[PDB]
Write a protein that binds this ligand. Structure first.
Ligand SMILES: Oc1ccc(-c2ccccc2)cc1O
Ligand SMILES: Oc1ccc(-c2ccccc2)cc1O
Ligand SMILES: Oc1ccc(-c2ccccc2)cc1O
Ligand SMILES: Oc1ccc(-c2ccccc2)cc1O
Ligand SMILES: Oc1ccc(-c2ccccc2)cc1O
Ligand SMILES: Oc1ccc(-c2ccccc2)cc1O
Ligand SMILES: Oc1ccc(-c2ccccc2)cc1O
Ligand SMILES: Oc1ccc(-c2ccccc2)cc1O
Ligand SMILES: Oc1ccc(-c2ccccc2)cc1O
Ligand SMILES: Oc1ccc(-c2ccccc2)cc1O
Ligand SMILES: Oc1ccc(-c2ccccc2)cc1O
Ligand SMILES: Oc1ccc(-c2ccccc2)cc1O
Ligand SMILES: Oc1ccc(-c2ccccc2)cc1O
Ligand SMILES: Oc1ccc(-c2ccccc2)cc1O
Ligand SMILES: Oc1ccc(-c2ccccc2)cc1O
Ligand SMILES: Oc1ccc(-c2ccccc2)cc1O
Ligand SMILES: Oc1ccc(-c2ccccc2)cc1O
Ligand SMILES: Oc1ccc(-c2ccccc2)cc1O
Ligand SMILES: [Fe+2]
Ligand SMILES: [Fe+2]
Ligand SMILES: [Fe+2]
Ligand SMILES: [Fe+2]
Ligand SMILES: [Fe+2]
Ligand SMILES: [Fe+2]
Ligand SMILES: [Mg+2]
Ligand SMILES: [Mg+2]
Ligand SMILES: [Mg+2]
Ligand SMILES: [Mg+2]
Ligand SMILES: [Mg+2]
Ligand SMILES: [Mg+2]
Lengths: 286, 286, 286, 286, 286, 286
């Protein structure tokens, strides 16, 4: 037992007001403002938060927060990382409290992406999720964590070694006429992290969030079209996770992938040379 | 495989007659009197008993009895405790027979709470449970054991180490504006033991018993109100176990927590800063 | 829609104290004494009662109480009986209140058995069933009513005509080397009333009561043997209802048939020439 | 409510000993000999019998026995037949007892096939089915009756009118390059009676019996091949009932159709111009 | 993985003809006679046999045959027994073929009961079970093996050590006012072997066989009563396995325990001081 | 975790055009021609292919391709084979790409059958299976792989050792009056590889392919009969896998076994001395 979900993530942004409107109106996320001068939160479920939005930022990813079941797994994984030669820091109580977790360690993946491992998230059971716009349904989180990210890597083999140590499984799932793309899971979500060896100006290529209801995905798509927000890739279904998704611009320039109907992860490695349908390029430059 | 349930407990009381009326009328427990001069039994199910009520007492907990599956697990856990430096005594046949078990060992937890580990409880299949008052339903026991207790500790870290060795799982689940409260499970019951570092005049803070039917919980609540018995904390739902419960005075001064609809234990550590609703203070001094 | 269950019955007895001990210890029925000088009640479930036990009696049946769904069905069946030439009396409020029902009519079946038709039984939801001895389970009642009775008839064809008018279905199900026995249902209970053309000193041959648990039936059987109460017919399984049952003496001389595992009534008429096994004569003269 | 199953049938044979061996070894039916000089019985289930085999016979069908639910349906259908101009006879008790039924009437269908309508078959629950050879499974009977027959008709429209009056449903289901074949159901069995306008030397073309297990059908097929019994039509699946079946000679010259996996009857009329596969002619002259 | 079922057993008898009639008529077992001069077989299911009945015998147990999953488990358990100091013999092909198994080893338990361990039983799928009398149902075998036996032991602790090594689980389950009785399982059958420290003239106290249907158990009971065969213990339900059973004499003097409705084995050790009901002594001297 | 399915196989043929017509018309496989001069593909499902058909061939098996879950299992099994003394070659990227897999190693089994182990098959999710003739259903593949093969062996013990190392389970399942036949599984398919010690001119005795629908199996059988293709063994059911199958000639002379309704593999070794029914010899010389 090691990493069990993508529990939270932090991003930094240059336009917090635009991000609040985008998150609520375009996606249906809930804005939680605790009156902090430099950040606010986005909720998806009973967790106090799933995304921390830092102000005065770089319009990129700040950290991914990977959950382990408890203290025993936290301690075991820490030692495992040390023994394998990785540089980690166990955080003090102030730093853990900043993230609202019971235990916290910080490191960087082989691509330079700041990576946090924690146990004991804060759950606000007294405060049920209340979406930023009316929703037919809710989000798929639970044992699948918040969603998935594709992040920049320079050495795919080293990236794979690192995430394997963290307890992820997966390998090259697409060979695109040849670019190889690798996808890894740490729970039932088909993938939680993925990467290839392509150049990228930003740490974060995209974040995928999953609705329980197709009606919310469709309405989200309609919101993007109505507000003339760039759709980088049109609606389609992935050969790996079988989800219906599209990719749209965020105010930070990296992409959001709203989706629906993701399939369960499998440990039997398969690869494909294309998607089931759709996901055609529309807006260029992403 | 180690401890699998809170199998029995012993308490001592100053007023056995009051305890008989309380147990039967207020809670629906069954009184079994085997004609012993110094004790009687309370039943909840087919077990010969779940609670031993000793006379001429201190109005506090006398022992918690933790079950293991069988002799192999009993022997293994005994040696484990010895190897870790804890002081245990394997009881002879007379002492085992007193508790009506096939094998028995005695120790104390780090807080000084007398702790028994046993295998092979006596089950009276010929003698079905017959509650002390008419019930709509029955009690939740089975693989969840009799209920849960909160007991006094002086060193939470040492307590955690001890119960971890016994096969329990769990950690700090509430941070209350800061008091930290730890809750541990050894089966599907969300918790069977819990504790914090607060001072306490008694070993036992409260015992929780769970009804299968909301109607019995409601009627129990009504019995407390009708008989003007102190309700220390009003009806509410816990963020951790999701049960509907209240807390009322017993004749011994420590609290009973009658409840309904407890959720299954989880190994993924979460924490909260408050309950879902209710559990407001009413009667003070508990 | 007409008669839907055997809702209650009244019996009269010469020895109420013996009947109280018998009902509680031998059968597990609940005694309810409302302080009336001339009667007490036996409960099986949430109904205020299922059996009224009148004192200063004849050790026989006093009345069968047949339930209809509501007032519309009550009125329709009343008129149906009148139109077919049967003599009925619609009872006033005092008489209805005596039986604790909202509407009541009285008549006699063609065999002279006093027959009541009612709607709106009193249900004491606040007062859950509490058996007269510890039980593993409870009784089968609900949409199947309290049980079944075999009652005396002089003209089977006329009896059949009467119960058919009341909404029962069924005919000759046994031809015994030749005695013909007829069995009729008004709900899922395989039969609620049955009869043949044999002579009988009493209105009531037997009453069948059904346990949910085989363990209670077995213990009941053991109670009869231990207390040296006559077993008229030994354990066996009926070809029609497939229940495991035996027949034992009551203090009134007519028989009780405790049983378990009755099958659902069928509208497709079948007959048999014997039972599946058992039901051999033991104590003679019943 | 009218006819609900093909309950029994009678055949007459010239070689009873050959029929006993055939029924037991080739089909797995149970022979019941009640010591009558002129007949024996074949069982398939708990019914006393499903087929009566008369000696000194014509090697053809003697009667089909159609069940109604009870006396009310029996009386109603009798009057219906009379009112429509058909000739029926209500049988006395001796004649009913010969067939082991509670009520019996006799007529002929428009093709001259002797037709009986009855209620109240004799079920020997004390005497479970015991097949004439070891079987993996048993027969499909229950609410589907014993099987189906194809019988001779001279006027298909009149036949249809008659069976419609009896409560059957169905029409032309095959148009074979053109011969029209009509199939009618009276319960979940896809068909219980069928016919066309072709000439036939015998009343009975074939009887279909259905096994619960494919292994028994296969072994039956193997028995026919091993004993060099004519297979008139090879294994195949019918477009209407979707059953896997073959057709083999009986000692009487008409055909048995052993089968497996019949589909539920439908009230929505369909037709086909051929079967799904197989049912090719092998032995000619049937 | 070690012993997974009681696969077969061998007994020797003085009166084979009496045993054939008893097995078929009284129990519904199938007699298979392969024309061997010194033995015949009893079947319960698709296995070639479950019981070997040797002639010219001692009216006692000859061997218990314990199945392991395959060759790897066979080899591992053999070495385990050798390493623990037990005396075993690996049988040659002739001896294995005598038992109709692919691999066979022979030893004796600490009580002197001949004990065989094997893999690869012969299953006659072509030859479905055909009971020796008509049955409503069949036997419970499959992953539960043929039944259970109680056998003589002189040293219960040594017996327990031996069966524990074989992969069984269980301990003292009854303390009878004090006699201790131990019961061990190797699959879902509540127990497959049991023993105490009481003296016994024979190796075998009783064999329990389980019907799928209560109707067959009842009819079996009726057969014993009708044929005036001693019933040593009357119908009752065991506190441990919850089965309805009785105990009757066999022609060899040891007891058969026909039963119905056995519960699943549990690894959590419980004990009782009596049964649920019944099992009263009738015929003495067993 | 080691081999998890028969993922693909390669055959070589002398008449590719005949094989195309045979595969499509007689079996319903899909022909995929990628324009390669020396080979084409047969599909059964979403995999790019299940069978590679090489031209200019020997009318025999060229290779069996055994799948492992992923790279870790591939590497572990490779080392396991090396450590046990087997000769393996890890293939370069060109060779892996030829088979359309992410990782590939080559060896020979002890019988000389070329054996490939791979991970990461190419799945064409964009290109759903389209059978070569209309089908009622599809093929059974998924976690059961493509089917099973019987291949030539010279030393059954060495063969068993090799496939055991690969993670297969199974042993002798038939003893035929004596020829011993061994059957091994690596997933839920009852067997994926089988063999005996009989002489064979070809590596491949037969390939079994399984339909989801009996109607397709029947139609396939009909196609063989219509086109006068040799049926070596007639329809029957295997005692081990319980499937309905027949065996027919392919254009290469080795046999295809089309079938339906295979049972789940079991780890508990059984043997038989014959099939359930059928599988009688028809066309000789196979
Ligand atoms: O390393 C792994 C992490 C998670 C899963 C997993 C968990 C639940 C469902 C599906 C896959 C599988 C893995 O091999
Ligand atoms: O420009 C990019 C396009 C696609 C991916 C990508 C998508 C899925 C998995 C791995 C990488 C990453 C990129 O930086
Ligand atoms: O979640 C994802 C799953 C699959 C692909 C993908 C599919 C085809 C080509 C490139 C990327 C991209 C994703 O972001
Ligand atoms: O130490 C442990 C003891 C018991 C359970 C458990 C058992 C059943 C359901 C849920 C949790 C989980 C544990 O980690
Ligand atoms: O006065 C007290 C109040 C609350 C708890 C408590 C409740 C739940 C878990 C741990 C400690 C313990 C106390 O002694
Ligand atoms: O069973 C229990 C679960 C949770 C709490 C609790 C909740 C909030 C604050 C303090 C204690 C107390 C309990 O007795
Ligand atoms: O007159 C009738 C009364 C009751 C039922 C019935 C109701 C429920 C289940 C089974 C039979 C059927 C009848 O024909
Ligand atoms: O002496 C009697 C014996 C049996 C029945 C009886 C039992 C079942 C149905 C109908 C009548 C009625 C009697 O008066
Ligand atoms: O409820 C009953 C069901 C069937 C019979 C019966 C069975 C055989 C012969 C006589 C009566 C008697 C009953 O009291
Ligand atoms: O006249 C009819 C007789 C029987 C059925 C029937 C009953 C059960 C299942 C399917 C069809 C449908 C009819 O229209
Ligand atoms: O020679 C015959 C061939 C076929 C049928 C038949 C089969 C099915 C339905 C209706 C008639 C009837 C015959 O007399
Ligand atoms: O039960 C039957 C269902 C269908 C046909 C049939 C099918 C095609 C042509 C002719 C008869 C024949 C049958 O005996
Ligand atoms: O040694 C053992 C052998 C068998 C079972 C078992 C298997 C299936 C169901 C219940 C218990 C449990 C054991 O501890
Ligand atoms: O005479 C005897 C009576 C009972 C048992 C027995 C029954 C169950 C378990 C263990 C021993 C064994 C005996 O030899
Ligand atoms: O299978 C058995 C289960 C339990 C007992 C038993 C129960 C009470 C006292 C003595 C033996 C005896 C058995 O043969
Ligand atoms: O070596 C083995 C490989 C596969 C299975 C298996 C997997 C799924 C279902 C049934 C058997 C069992 C084995 O012992
Ligand atoms: O001629 C042959 C006949 C049968 C098998 C065979 C079939 C199943 C399993 C193992 C071998 C192999 C042969 O070479
Ligand atoms: O898949 C198969 C399963 C069983 C046998 C078999 C059965 C009996 C005798 C010989 C081979 C042959 C097969 O090809
Ligand atoms: Fe994505
Ligand atoms: Fe609590
Ligand atoms: Fe009755
Ligand atoms: Fe037919
Ligand atoms: Fe027993
Ligand atoms: Fe095969
Ligand atoms: Mg994946
Ligand atoms: Mg917890
Ligand atoms: Mg009836
Ligand atoms: Mg039809
Ligand atoms: Mg046990
Ligand atoms: Mg196998």
């Amino acid at each position: 037992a090691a990493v069990i979900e993508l529990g939270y993530m932090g991003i930094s942004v240059k336009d917090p007001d635009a991000w609040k409107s985008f998150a609520t109106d375009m996606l249906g996320l809930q804005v939680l403002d605790e009156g902090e001068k430099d950040r606010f939160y986005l909720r998806m479920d009973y967790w106090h938060h799933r995304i921390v939005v830092h102000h005065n930022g770089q319009d990129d990813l700040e950290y991914l927060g990977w959950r382990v079941a408890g203290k025993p797994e936290f301690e075991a994984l820490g030692q495992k990382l040390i023994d394998a030669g990785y540089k980690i820091r166990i955080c003090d109580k102030v730093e853990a409290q900043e993230r609202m977790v019971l235990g916290l360690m910080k490191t960087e993946d082989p691509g330079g992406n700041p990576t946090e491992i924690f146990w004991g998230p804060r759950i606000d059971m007294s405060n049920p999720f209340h979406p930023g716009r009316p929703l037919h349904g809710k989000f798929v989180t639970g044992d699948q964590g918040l969603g998935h990210c594709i992040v920049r890597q320079t050495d795919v083999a080293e990236a794979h070694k690192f995430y394997s140590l963290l307890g992820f499984r997966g390998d090259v799932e697409y060979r695109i006429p040849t670019a190889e793309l690798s996808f890894m899971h740490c729970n039932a979500r088909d993938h939680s992290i993925a990467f290839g060896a392509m150049p990228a100006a930003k740490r974060l290529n995209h974040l995928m969030l999953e609705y329980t209801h197709m009606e919310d995905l469709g309405y989200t798509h309609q919101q993007f079209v109505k507000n003339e927000i760039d759709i980088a890739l049109q609606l389609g279904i992935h050969a790996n996770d079988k989800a219906l998704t599209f990719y749209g611009a965020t105010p930070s320039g990296w992409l959001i992938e709203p989706g629906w109907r993701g399939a369960t992860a499998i440990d039997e490695a398969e690869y494909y040379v294309g998607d089931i349908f759709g996901h055609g390029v529309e807006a260029t430059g992403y």
